[PDB]
C-alpha cells in the first residue's frame, strides 16, 4: 500500500503538467523534475521529506506539454512543447541551457533504452518515424519504416531487445526491429475495445503481453507469429468505486490511474487486484501521476502544483 513519504510544493504561478524522477549527475543521485507550462525545474532531496530546487529552465511562447524520460541518460532532461499537439522536443541541461531536438508536426514520442529517443510525425504516406541517439548531443537519426497509419503511442517491449511497439489510429499494433529499422508486423486488435494507448508491453514465451487503457486497464495477449489475439485480462475497480480511467502510468508490474473520480487507483498487474485507492488531498483532484524511475515511489501531482510522493510496498 501507499505511504506518504515526502512532498514538494511548487507555487510556480504556472499550471503544473507533469513530473518525473530521474538520476542526475559526478554521481548518480535521485532527483525530481517538475514541469509547468512555462518552467521546468530540477529538485534534490533537502532532507527526509523536503525538496529543494537546483536548476530551472524557462519557456516563452510555446508551453511545456510533458516531460520525456530517456532511460540511461543522467545529464539532461527532455521535454515536449506544444499547446495540445507537440511542436518541439528540447533537451535541457547545464548553468542551464537548452537545445532544440526536433520541430514539426509531432504525433508521438518515447525515450528508449541506451540513450535513444523515438518520435513520429505526419499521418499517412507522409508519416516519418525516427529514432535519435545522444552521446550527449544530436548524434544519429535512424528512420524506421512507417506503417502509414498515424502512430498514437510507442512502447519498448520488455523482455527483448531491439523491439519497438506502436499503436495506430487504425486500432493496429505495429512492431519494428530497432536495429534494422524494419517494420516486422502489423496486427489488428479487435475493433474495440479498443486502445489506442499502450502503457506497457511484454514479451514472454513467444507471446506479447500488452497493457491498454479503457475496467480501467486491459491486458491483451497476442501471438505475434499468427497475429491473432489469444486472450484478454481485466483490471477493474473494487466492489464500490465510482470513476472511469482518465490517465495513468505503468512501471514494471504496477499500474496507476487517475479516475474521473479524482481518486487515483493502483493495481498489481500480475494478480489483477486493486491494491490501493488514494483520494485527493483536500478538494484538489489529482492532476497527474507517474511512477518514479529511480525508486519505489508513486508521484501524485496537483495543478497547484504540489507534488505528493508515496512509498509503494
Amino acid at each position: 500500500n501507499l505511504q506518504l513519504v515526502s512532498e514538494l510544493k511548487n507555487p510556480s504561478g504556472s499550471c503544473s503538467v507533469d513530473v518525473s524522477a530521474m538520476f542526475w549527475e559526478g554521481c548518480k543521485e535521485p532527483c525530481i523534475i517538475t514541469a509547468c507550462e512555462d518552467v521546468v525545474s530540477l529538485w534534490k532531496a533537502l532532507d527526509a521529506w523536503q525538496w529543494e530546487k537546483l536548476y530551472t529552465w524557462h519557456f516563452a511562447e510555446v508551453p511545456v506539454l510533458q516531460i520525456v524520460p530517456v532511460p540511461d541518460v543522467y545529464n539532461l532532461v527532455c521535454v515536449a512543447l506544444g499547446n495540445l499537439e507537440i511542436r518541439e522536443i528540447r533537451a535541457l541541461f547545464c548553468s542551464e541551457k537548452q537545445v532544440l531536438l526536433k520541430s514539426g508536426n509531432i504525433k508521438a514520442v518515447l525515450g528508449l533504452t541506451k540513450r535513444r529517443l523515438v518520435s513520429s510525425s505526419g499521418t499517412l504516406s507522409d508519416q516519418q518515424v525516427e529514432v535519435m541517439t545522444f552521446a550527449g548531443g544530436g548524434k544519429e537519426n535512424q528512420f524506421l519504416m512507417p506503417p502509414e497509419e498515424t502512430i498514437l503511442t510507442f512502447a519498448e517491449v520488455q523482455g527483448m531487445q531491439e523491439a519497438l511497439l506502436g499503436t495506430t489510429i487504425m486500432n493496429n499494433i505495429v512492431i519494428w526491429n530497432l536495429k534494422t529499422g524494419q517494420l516486422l508486423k502489423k496486427m489488428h486488435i479487435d475493433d474495440s475495445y479498443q486502445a489506442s494507448v499502450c502503457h506497457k508491453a511484454y514479451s514472454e514465451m513467444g507471446l506479447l503481453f500488452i497493457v491498454l487503457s479503457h475496467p480501467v486497464f486491459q491486458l491483451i495477449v497476442i501471438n505475434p507469429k499468427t497475429t491473432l489475439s489469444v486472450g484478454v485480462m481485466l483490471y477493474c475497480l473494487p466492489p464500490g468505486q465510482a470513476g472511469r480511467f482518465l490517465e495513468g502510468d505503468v512501471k514494471d508490474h504496477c499500474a496507476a490511474a487517475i479516475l474521473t473520480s479524482g481518486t487515483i487507483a493502483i493495481w498489481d498487474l500480475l494478480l489483477g487486484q486493486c491494491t490501493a485507492l488514494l483520494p485527493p488531498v483536500s478538494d484538489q483532484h489529482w492532476s497527474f501521476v507517474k511512477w518514479s524511475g529511480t525508486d519505489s515511489h508513486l508521484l501524485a501531482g496537483q495543478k497547484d502544483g504540489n507534488i505528493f510522493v508515496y512509498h509503494y510496498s
Binding site: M160, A163, N177, Q182, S203, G206
Partner: peptide
C-alpha cells in the same frame, strides 16, 4: 492450432 514461435522476432528480422 495457432503455432507459437519463441523466435518470431529474429525470424521476421531475417
Amino acid at each position: 492450432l495457432g503455432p507459437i514461435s519463441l523466435n518470431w522476432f529474429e525470424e521476421l528480422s531475417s
